From Swiss-Prot:
The chain holds residues 14 to 290 of 1273 of the full protein. Glycans are attached at residues 4, 48, 100, 136, 195, 232. Binds to host ACE2. RBD also interacts with the N-linked glycan on 'Asn-90' of ACE2. Cleavage of S generates a polybasic C-terminal sequence on S1 that binds to host Neuropilin-1 (NRP1) and Neuropilin-2 (NRP2) receptors. Interacts with host integrin alpha-5/beta-1 (ITGA5:ITGB1) and with ACE2 in complex with integrin alpha-5/beta-1 (ITGA5:ITGB1). May interact via cytoplasmic c-terminus with M protein. May interact (via N-terminus) with host bilirubin and biliverdin, thereby preventing antibody binding to the SARS-CoV-2 spike NTD via an allosteric mechanism. Attaches the virion to the cell membrane by interacting with host receptor, initiating the infection. The major receptor is host ACE2. When S2/S2' has been cleaved, binding to the receptor triggers direct fusion at the cell membrane. When S2/S2' has not been cleaved, binding to the receptor results in internalization of the virus by endocytosis using host TFRC and GRM2 and leading to fusion of the virion membrane with the host endosomal membrane. Alternatively, may use NRP1/NRP2 and integrin as entry receptors. This is Spike protein S1. Residues 120-135 are annotated as: Disordered. Residues 1-240 form the BetaCoV S1-NTD domain. Disulfide bonds join 2-114, 109-137. Changing residue 195 to Q: Increased resistance to neutralizing antibodies. Changing residue 116 to Y: In strain: Gamma/P.1. Changing residue 128 to L: In strain: A23.1, Omicron/BA.2.75. Changing residue 5 to F: In strain: Beta/B.1.351, Gamma/P.1, 19B/501Y. It comes from Severe acute respiratory syndrome coronavirus 2 (2019-nCoV). Changing residue 183 to V: In strain: 20A.EU1.
């Protein structure tokens, strides 16, 4: 494997604005209609969130500062997972997430991630061009797959736990993030306990066309929000 495609493309990043997005439930306790102020990692409102597009490749190693907010429209299922890790090489085991068509597999091993990892599709035949070798590891998780049907993901690595929050929303807006407030709900809390400082997304490439999609990467920062809870427990509004 390990085919290289990034010849010279070094276009400057395009910044959209994360108007009011990426606000999850930062607890496992149900709350009625009450004003509760939480002090946790959150994506600041109206922050400059980078805009990457499926076309022009755009699979850079993105720093995992304190947690990232991953939003992708991808009206066709082209996004396949993420390869969070510190070095993405030997001597440092890294976290890998992929869902094929009906099941998600999460592996944390000493992978040999290629310089341009991706997943091939043939008519849907899945081929792995992510890693060349994968051995000497302990963690293995499988469940229902995580995935214009906008979907947002927030990953955070705290106290040795890898926490994933997701919320799938159908949108009709043309290109950018929607206007409505949406509350993300956690999927899993994997006790991975590794050091994570960078990550990279995985696409589905045809035989090398890059389809037509885009993903949004914003970084969490420590902030104190005021979550407005509804009667059913849904966070209908929040302020910085």
């Amino acid at each position: 494997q390990c085919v290289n495609l990034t010849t010279r493309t070094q276009l400057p990043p395009a910044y959209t604005n994360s108007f009011t997005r990426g606000v999850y439930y930062p607890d496992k306790v149900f709350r009625s209609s009450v004003l509760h102020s939480t002090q946790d990692l959150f994506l600041p409102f109206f922050s400059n969130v980078t805009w990457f597009h499926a076309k022009r490749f755009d699979n850079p190693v993105l720093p995992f500062n304190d947690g990232v907010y991953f939003a992708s429209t991808e009206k066709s299922n082209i996004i396949r997972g993420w390869i969070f890790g510190t070095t993405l090489d030997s001597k440092t085991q890294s976290l890998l997430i992929v869902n094929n068509a009906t099941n998600v597999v999460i592996k944390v091993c000493e992978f040999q991630f290629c310089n341009d990892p991706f997943l091939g599709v043939y008519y849907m035949e899945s081929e792995f061009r992510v890693y060349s070798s994968a051995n000497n590891c302990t963690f293995e998780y499988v469940s229902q797959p995580f995935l214009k049907n906008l979907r947002e993901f927030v990953f955070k690595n705290i106290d040795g736990y890898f926490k994933i929050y997701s919320k799938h929303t159908p949108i009709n807006l043309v290109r950018d993030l929607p206007q409505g407030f949406s509350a993300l709900e956690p999927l899993v809390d994997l006790p991975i306990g590794i050091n994570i400082t960078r990550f990279q997304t995985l696409l589905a490439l045809h035989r090398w066309t890059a389809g037509a999609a885009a993903y949004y990467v914003g970084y969490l920062q420590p902030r104190t929000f005021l979550l407005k809870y509804n009667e059913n427990g849904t966070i209908t509004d929040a302020v910085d």
